[PDB]
Amino acid sequence: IAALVVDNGSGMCKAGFAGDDAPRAVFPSIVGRPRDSYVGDEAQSKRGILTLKYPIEHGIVTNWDDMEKIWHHTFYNELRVAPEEHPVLLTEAPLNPKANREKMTQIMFETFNTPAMYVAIQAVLSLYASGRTTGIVMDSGDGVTHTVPIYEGYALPHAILRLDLAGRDLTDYLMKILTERGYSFTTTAEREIVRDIKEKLCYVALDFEQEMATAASSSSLEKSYELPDGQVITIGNERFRCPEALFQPSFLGMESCGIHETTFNSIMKCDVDIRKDLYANTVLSGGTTMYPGIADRMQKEITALAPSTMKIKIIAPPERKYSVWIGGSILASLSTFQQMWISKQEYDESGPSIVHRKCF
Amino acid sequence: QERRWKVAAAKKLVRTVVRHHEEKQLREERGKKEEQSRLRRIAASTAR
Amino acid sequence: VGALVFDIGSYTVRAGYAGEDCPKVDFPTSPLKNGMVEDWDSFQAILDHTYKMHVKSEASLHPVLMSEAPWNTRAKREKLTELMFEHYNIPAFFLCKTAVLTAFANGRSTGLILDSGATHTTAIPVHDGYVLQQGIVKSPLAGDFITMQCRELFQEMNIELRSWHNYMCNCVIQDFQASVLQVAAQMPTVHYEFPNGYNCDFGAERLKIPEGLFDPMLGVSHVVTTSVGMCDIDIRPGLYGSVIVAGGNTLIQSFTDRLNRELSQKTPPSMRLKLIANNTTVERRFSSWIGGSILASLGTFQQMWISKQEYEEGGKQCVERKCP
C-alpha cells in the first residue's frame, strides 16, 4: 500500500508520497515533441529531435495528451510505482473551469484506473501546511499569481484575484534589462542562466529610490558572478530592479495594482468583520519568491497602506517552495480524510460529474 | 443542503489540522524533557 | 594496562595513572587560552608529547580518561572523542568535568567549587555529581590578573623581570606570589631574593596585589554568592556547608581564610557555611587529578568509559551520551 501526492507547479512538476517531507521526484514541467514525445528533462536532453513545450500554460492545461504523457513517464521512471493500487491526490489553481476538472478526472479513471482520487486547490493545501485557521493567501506561484482569502478552511471564488505574473515574466524582464546593460540572452541556456543569476544575487529593495542612489554610488550592490562561460557580470541596481516591478507593473509596460495593492483590493473584497484577522494572517507562496528584503518590505508597505488600527502580522515561511505539496502530504496523512476519497466504481456508477458532486 | 454541508466539512478539517500541529509540538517538547530527565537519571546512576 | 588519568589544565598538565596518588608528570601547558582546545594540532601534539615523552607508553594499550572544563562547548567534546579515538586508538575513553573530579577528590559529591587557571576564575555548584551549568559564574579576576599586577609592580621597580625568557618572566611572578603575596598596613616584610640576587623590601605590595581579586569586575566572593543565587533555592544550604577550593592559582597566604570571612559576613550568619581546607599546593594542584584518578580506578568504571567499541558503532554522539 502507498499514498500518492501530486503537486503540479506552474512550470515544474514535483510529486511525492503522503507522509514524505519532500517530493519524490522534481523537474521542470515541459514536454518534448518530435517534428515519441518525451517528458520534461527527458525531452530537454533530446532537444535536437524533441521541441520544448509547456502543457501548463498560464498555469492552465493545454492538451490532454501532454500531461497524459508527463504522468506516463512520471509513473514509469521517476515514481516507478503502481499508482493503480494507491489513492491519487491532485491539485489545481482556483477558478478552474469544470471542463478541466471532469477531463482530468476521466483521464485518471480511464487511462490509469487508480482506485482513490481527490482534488483540492493549491493555496488551501499550502495554508494547511502553514497551520493556521483563517487568513489570506497570496499565490505568488511560479507562472501565475492569485490572492486567496481562505476562511475556516473555506474560500470564496469571487473574492479571489488573478494575475499571470510570476517567476517566468520576472526572469524575462531581468533578461531584458541585463541585455540592455550590454549583455545578451537568447536561448534556453541564457534564460536559465538569467534565472540562476536572479536566484543568486537578486533581492528586493527596501527604499527603491535610495536603493538606486546606493547602487549608483555604493558599488557594493554591483557584484561579480561567474557565468557558465566564466564571464564576470557587474550587477548593481538590476539585482532588485526587476522585483520592484511586482509593485510597479509599469516596469514592463503593464498597468495594474502592485502586489500589496492587489492584496488590499482582495481584503476589501472580503467582509470587514475579519479583515483585521486576515491582516494578522498574511501568507507567502513560491520558491521563486523568497528573495531578500521581500517579506520586510511588503510588511512595511502593508503597514503603510493598511490602516494601522489593525494588526498586520506577516507570515513568511522561508520553506514555502513546497508549501502546497507539504500540505498535500499532511492531508493525505489524515484519518478523517481517508473516507473522503473517491473510488473507481463510484465513477463507474456516477460518471465524471461525481467529482463536482463530492470532490470539494 | 450541500451548501450547509461543505462549510461544515471545511470547519472539521481545520479543527483536525490544528489539533495535529498541537500534538506535534507537544510531543517535541515532552521528548526533550524526557531526554534531559533521563540524562539526570544516568547522572544519578553515576551518583549511585 | 593501569588506567591513565591526565589533566590538561589551562596552565599546567597533570598526568598519571589511575592507581597512583600523584600525577607522575606535571609540566606547563598554549592551545587552551579560553578554557577549551583552541588549537587542535598543538593540542594533539602536546598529547602526543605526553604519551611518548612524559609517560613513555603508547596510548593504544592503556585505558584513558580525559577531564574537561565545566563551561566548555559540546563541539569540543565531539571533536575530542573524534581526535582521540582516531589518532591514538585507545581501548576505552571517558570525559569528566574538572569541577566534578575536585568534588570527587574531596570525597563530597554535593558541593560548590572555586578554582582559577589561565585567564579564568569560576564558581560551579555541583549537586549529586551534576554540574549546574546555569549556576556557573565565570570571572576574569584569575591568578593571571594578580600576577600581571606583580609584573607591572616589578616593572615599576625597574628590575629586568626567546619564548623561554617569557616563561622565566612569567614563572618568577608566580613564584613571588607564593612566597610574598598575602591577603605600612603590612608592617616590615620579607627579603625575597631573585636568582641574580636582586631584591627589595616588598612592603604593602604583598597586601594590595592580592586584593585585586576581591577589589581590583566581580570579586571571587561576588562570583560565588551570586552563583548560588542562580541555582535552586533549597539546595543552597547544602552548597554553603560544602564549599571547596582547588587550583594552584588559589595558593595565596590567608587566601582561604579571607574567603571564609568574606562569605561568613556575606552569607546569612545562621547558615552552616564551611570551607574544606585543601589549602596545600599539593592538595590544590592534584585535586582535579585525584578525583579523576579515583574515578578511573573504581570497579564501576568498568562500565562507565566509552570503550573503543562504542566509538565504532557510534561516532562523536557517544560523548554526550556516556559522559554527564
Swiss-Prot record, chain A:
Q: Which GO terms describe its biological process?
A: adherens junction assembly; apical protein localization; axonogenesis; cell motility; cellular response to cytochalasin B; chromatin remodeling; cytoskeleton organization; establishment or maintenance of cell polarity
Q: Pfam families from the entry?
A: Actin
Mutating R132S has which effect? Answer: In CSMH; also found in isolated non-syndromic Becker nevi; somatic variant
Check the record and name the SUPFAM superfamilies matching this protein.
Actin-like ATPase domain
The outcome of changing G59A is:
Impaired methylation by SETD3
Q: Which UniProt keywords apply?
A: Acetylation, ATP-binding, Cytoplasm, Cytoskeleton, Deafness, Disease variant, Dystonia, Hydrolase, Intellectual disability, Isopeptide bond, Methylation, Nucleotide-binding, Nucleus, Oxidation, Ubl conjugation
According to the UniProt record, what happens if one changes W64E?
Answer: Does not affect methylation by SETD3
Any keyword GTP-binding? Answer: no
Record bears the keyword Isomerase: no
User: What InterPro entries does this protein map onto?
Assistant: Actin (IPR004000), Actin/actin-like_CS (IPR020902), Actin_CS (IPR004001), ATPase_NBD (IPR043129)
Q: What does the record give under GO molecular function?
A: ATP binding; ATP hydrolysis activity; identical protein binding; kinesin binding; nitric-oxide synthase binding; nitric-oxide synthase regulator activity; protein kinase binding; structural constituent of cytoskeleton
Q: How the protein is affected by changing I56A?
A: Impaired methylation by SETD3
SMART domains, per database record: ACTIN
What PROSITE patterns does UniProt report for this protein, alphabetically? ACTINS_1, ACTINS_2, ACTINS_ACT_LIKE
Q: Which residues carry this modification: N6-methyllysine?
A: K69
Q: Any idea what job this protein has?
A: Actin is a highly conserved protein that polymerizes to produce filaments that form cross-linked networks in the cytoplasm of cells. Actin exists in both monomeric (G-actin) and polymeric (F-actin) forms, both forms playing key functions, such as cell motility and contraction. In addition to their role in the cytoplasmic cytoskeleton, G- and F-actin also localize in the nucleus, and regulate gene transcription and motility and repair of damaged DNA.
The record's family statement is:
Belongs to the actin family.
Q: What is this protein called?
A: Actin, cytoplasmic 1
Please report the organism this UniProt entry assigns to the protein: Homo sapiens
Swiss-Prot record, chain B:
Tissue localization of expression: Ubiquitously expressed.
**Intracellular or extracellular location(s):** Nucleus
Q: Taxonomically, which superkingdom?
A: Eukaryota
Q: Where is the HSA domain?
A: 1-44
Annotated disulfide bonds: none
Q: Which family does it belong to?
A: Belongs to the SNF2/RAD54 helicase family. SWR1 subfamily.
What the protein does?
Answer: Component of the NuA4 histone acetyltransferase complex which is involved in transcriptional activation of select genes principally by acetylation of nucleosomal histones H4 and H2A. This modification may both alter nucleosome - DNA interactions and promote interaction of the modified histones with other proteins which positively regulate transcription. May be required for transcriptional activation of E2F1 and MYC target genes during cellular proliferation.
Quaternary structure annotation from Swiss-Prot or TrEMBL: Component of the NuA4 histone acetyltransferase complex which contains the catalytic subunit KAT5/TIP60 and the subunits EP400, TRRAP/PAF400, BRD8/SMAP, EPC1, DMAP1/DNMAP1, RUVBL1/TIP49, RUVBL2, ING3, actin, ACTL6A/BAF53A, MORF4L1/MRG15, MORF4L2/MRGX, MRGBP, YEATS4/GAS41, VPS72/YL1 and MEAF6. May also participate in the formation of NuA4 related complexes which lack the KAT5/TIP60 catalytic subunit, but which include the SWI/SNF related protein SRCAP. The NuA4 complex interacts with MYC and the adenovirus E1A protein. EP400 interacts with TRRAP, RUVBL1 and RUVBL2.
- Spell out the protein name for this chain: E1A-binding protein p400
Which organism's genome codes for this protein?
Homo sapiens (Human)
Q: Which residues of the full protein are shown?
A: 828 to 875 of 3159
UniProtKB/Swiss-Prot annotation, chain C:
Task: Establish whether keyword Transcription regulation is in the entry.
Answer: yes
Pfam families cross-referenced by the UniProt entry: Actin
Which GO molecular function, any one, fits this protein according to its record?
Answer: chromatin binding
Keywords in alphabetical order = Acetylation, Activator, Chromatin regulator, Disease variant, DNA damage, DNA recombination, DNA repair, Growth regulation, Intellectual disability, Isopeptide bond, Neurogenesis, Nucleus, Phosphoprotein, Transcription, Transcription regulation, Ubl conjugation
Q: Where Phosphoserine occurs along the chain?
A: S30
Family annotation (CDD domains): ASKHA_NBD_Arp4_ACTL6-like (cd13395)
List the SUPFAM superfamilies hit by this protein, alphabetically: Actin-like ATPase domain (SSF53067)
Q: Does the keyword Transferase apply?
A: no
Provide the protein's localization. Answer: Nucleus
InterPro entries per the UniProt record, alphabetical: Actin, Actin_CS, ATPase_NBD
Give the domain of life: Eukaryota
Q: Got a GO cellular component term for this one?
A: nucleosome
The UniProt entry's GO biological process terms, in alphabetical order, are: blastocyst formation; chromatin remodeling; DNA recombination; DNA repair; negative regulation of cell differentiation; nervous system development; neural retina development; positive regulation of cell differentiation
The entry sums up its family as follows: Belongs to the actin family.
Q: What does this protein do?
A: Involved in transcriptional activation and repression of select genes by chromatin remodeling (alteration of DNA-nucleosome topology). Component of SWI/SNF chromatin remodeling complexes that carry out key enzymatic activities, changing chromatin structure by altering DNA-histone contacts within a nucleosome in an ATP-dependent manner. Required for maximal ATPase activity of SMARCA4/BRG1/BAF190A and for association of the SMARCA4/BRG1/BAF190A containing remodeling complex BAF with chromatin/nuclear matrix.
Query: Which disease is the protein involved in?
Result: ACTL6A mutations have been found in patients with intellectual disability of variable severity, developmental delay, dysmorphic features and digit abnormalities. Additional features may include genitourinary and cardiac defects. The disease phenotype resembles Coffin-Siris syndrome and brachymorphism-onychodysplasia-dysphalangism syndrome.
From the Swiss-Prot or TrEMBL record, give the protein name: Actin-like protein 6A
Species this chain originates from: Homo sapiens
